[PDB]
């Protein structure tokens, strides 16, 4: 009877293991995207300093 009541808990456990991978993959993707925007911004700054007018 206790093991039968635990069937909903087992579904939530197995689904949570999948969702923990999913959440952290999605969040790592968000951070990689913004990190690459900052990488492109650092490149764009290294371009801005080539124009002596703005760089002055």
């Amino acid at each position: 009877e206790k093991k039968e009541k635990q069937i909903e808990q087992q579904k939530k456990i197995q689904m949570s293991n999948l969702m923990n991978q999913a959440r952290l993959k999605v969040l790592r993707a968000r951070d990689d995207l913004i990190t690459d925007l900052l990488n492109e911004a650092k490149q764009r700054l290294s371009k801005v300093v080539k124009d002596t007018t703005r760089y002055q």
Binding site: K3, E4, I7, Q10
Partner: protein, 57 residues
């Protein structure tokens, strides 16, 4: 004459000792069999609960 009384008394001791001793030995065997068969039935009930749980799982 007297030999039938000798045979009755020797058989009286033999029967009264042996029949009781065999029943005492049977009592111990039946008690051991109760534990063994109870456990075997408990294992069959466990196997049923497990097969039933697998059908839920």
């Amino acid at each position: 004459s007297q030999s039938q009384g000798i045979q009755q008394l020797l058989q009286a001791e033999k029967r009264a000792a042996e029949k009781v001793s065999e029943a005492r030995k049977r009592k111990n065997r039946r008690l051991k069999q109760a534990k063994e068969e109870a456990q075997a039935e408990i294992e069959q009930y466990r196997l049923q609960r497990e097969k039933e749980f697998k059908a839920k799982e």
